[PDB]
Design a protein around this ligand. Structure first.
Ligand SMILES: Nc1ncnc2c1ncn2[C@@H]1O[C@H](COP(=O)(O)OP(=O)(O)O)[C@@H](O)[C@H]1O
Ligand SMILES: Nc1ncnc2c1ncn2[C@@H]1O[C@H](COP(=O)(O)OP(=O)(O)O)[C@@H](O)[C@H]1O
Ligand SMILES: Oc1cccc([C@@H]2NC(=S)NC3=C2[C@H](O)CCC3)c1
Ligand SMILES: Oc1cccc([C@@H]2NC(=S)NC3=C2[C@H](O)CCC3)c1
Ligand SMILES: [Mg+2]
Ligand SMILES: [Mg+2]
Lengths: 324, 329
């Protein structure tokens, strides 16, 4: 029920100057195949909900996985997309993207743009003149060493950690004290909010060891919706989650995520949500009422074989998770 | 002889609201900076420098007044170096590199927040394309962290790979960094992507190395080979170099290069016969910029906050002593 897709990254310039890809993707068979030994070899094979080869562009990812998810958010559902995988495989690439070099494109037209910018820009486009009044708010909550950080609040620095509490009102919910929600009033406000995030992230990285590889980041967008004739109320939420790299100090949230998934697929009565910040904040995305997808990202380099195999096995198990 | 300038940064968002009151007064006409060390009724310390720039100073004021006269020297065939020195948080990177105005408001070559490096490269092409000059520009970015050396512009190697340094056998007191890449910049439409590539590699450097942005020293080098032909058919072959150095934060891991830089300045001001250039990577790379044949400037960056009093005094004292260093043959 949880939707699991595989994305392979392409080779960097250093791998050319010349590397052989050990990963073969077959989208129509929806399968990924890894070469483990070597004219004559052994291979490992996995079927996923969708597979995306090294030639896949950002627009292909958005149109195939995000577009249907965003339609469901607009319908009034909560959705979550995780990116999972080894550092270096394209978790941030997929979730955020990058800017094309030399100011070639405006941010809205940049084909290297990832899920977060494309989504924000499309919400405004989809709801431009249907019967739906709406507002958009975003937050970016991050977890490093089991501490909480607000990367969007422009009035306090990143030494300041946030406090998490059980929410009495709705069970299995939490309240993050001091977490800021920025109203995104229109498309022309999006980019600078994203820039503020990047700036504060650069501060985080100088103060915290391997921040960009070791932190989990949860970019949340909330769409409040109202249609008329009588007022019909829709609230849509989407979490865009860029996990800490899965490579094997200790990452309690990452360890706990794995153990939660294990419990859910084995149908164990006890599921250890409370054992980390990440699984408490996202418990509804794991066997709850939220529609969830996982993008498992992998490398094509034979160097990365073991971690590529670990990610695939991990992601494949997760296919068996049921929610809603 | 080494020219020392002070740049006070403005107050940020978080302090203007806390109604922050500057302990720092800048008097550019009198080339002076005044610090309230006591704090209606106060005590003050006063320093005269070669140039002083208050909180109101823009990037273009810095360029026009300090950089354009030095670049003219580089175009003439001299080697020149500019250092930024000061506490983390004071504007060393803002001064040397600049930032982007938010929301894609401007192109890179018109951005008011652009710093020394992009302004210089844009202008080299502007200055030498205008008159009659065949020229070539080569750039390199060498960074020192934990006394190891990194090439932050090589787009064919990652930052695990540190370079080796050697004495240059022929020209005495020079150095050879093995493997350091020089990237030719053919035109001004090629500047921005190269700068971006450096920023990308820095991001990875920061992930791998603790407090990389605060603890590293970076040397951005520009080399201009010029074949000017005058209107009378006179041909000049000139080669100029400019090193734009963003030093590690001066606040009080030992930083051998930062420690050695201070001791080199002490030796050169007290006129001591032995100058400990050889005691660090930085002072070996830049030894000619410290009592050598290179014309050098230091830009000391400082904060207006009363909270930063002790480090602000430290910076000013450090920078003021540097005024007494002579170079050039
Ligand atoms: N699909 C892709 N297309 C082009 N480049 C990619 C792709 N995926 C990853 N990369 C490159 O690989 C590098 C590492 O990707 P990144 O997103 O930072 O990985 P991670 O977030 O998993 O550590 C980046 O420089 C990025 O440009
Ligand atoms: N002259 C200035 N004008 C406006 N903002 C500045 C100035 N100098 C520094 N800042 C701001 O203060 C912060 C610290 O700047 P930065 O260059 O990172 O300091 P350093 O490199 O010395 O640690 C940045 O957010 C920067 O935008
Ligand atoms: O092509 C892009 C268009 C818009 C945004 C993005 C990236 N994504 C996100 S989330 N934040 C940031 C991005 C930029 O690279 C750097 C600034 C922050 C790429
Ligand atoms: O306004 C700017 C115009 C051009 C360049 C710059 C900055 N400076 C230098 S050296 N590198 C980089 C800058 C950018 O902000 C980010 C990319 C790298 C600012
Ligand atoms: Mg990443
Ligand atoms: Mg800096």
């Amino acid at each position: 029920n949880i939707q699991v897709v595989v994305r392979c990254r392409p080779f960097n310039l250093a791998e050319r100057k010349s590397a052989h890809s050990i990963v073969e993707c077959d989208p129509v068979r929806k399968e990924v195949s890894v070469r483990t030994g070597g004219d004559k070899s052994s291979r490992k094979t996995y079927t996923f909900d969708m597979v995306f080869g090294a030639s896949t562009k950002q627009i292909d990812v958005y149109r195939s996985v995000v577009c249907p998810i965003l339609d469901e958010v607009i319908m009034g559902y909560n959705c979550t997309i995780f990116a999972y995988g080894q550092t270096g495989t394209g978790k941030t690439f997929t979730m955020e993207g990058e800017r094309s070099p030399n100011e070639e494109y405006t941010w809205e037209e940049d084909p290297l743009a990832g899920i977060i910018p494309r989504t924000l820009h499309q919400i405004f486009e989809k709801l431009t003149d249907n019967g739906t009044e709406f507002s958009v708010k975003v937050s970016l909550l991050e977890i490093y060493n089991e501490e909480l950080f607000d990367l969007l609040n422009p009035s306090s620095d990143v030494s300041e950690r946030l406090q998490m509490f059980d929410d009495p009102r709705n069970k299995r919910g939490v309240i993050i004290k001091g977490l800021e929600e920025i109203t995104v009033h229109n498309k022309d406000e999006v980019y600078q909010i994203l820039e503020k995030g990047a700036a504060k992230r650069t501060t985080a990285a100088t103060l915290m060891n391997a921040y960009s590889s070791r932190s989990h980041s949860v970019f949340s967008v909330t769409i409040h919706m109202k249609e008329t004739t009588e007022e019909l109320v829709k609230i849509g939420k989407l979490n865009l989650v860029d996990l800490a790299g899965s490579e094997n100090n200790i990452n309690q949230s990452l360890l706990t995520l794995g153990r939660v998934i294990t419990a859910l697929v084995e149908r164990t009565p006890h599921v250890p949500y409370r054992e980390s910040k990440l699984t408490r904040i996202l418990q509804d995305s794991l066997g709850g009422r939220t529609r969830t997808s996982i993008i498992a990202t992998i490398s094509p380099a034979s160097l990365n074989l073991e971690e590529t195999l670990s990610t695939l096995e991990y992601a494949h198990r997760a296919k068996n998770i049921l929610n809603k």
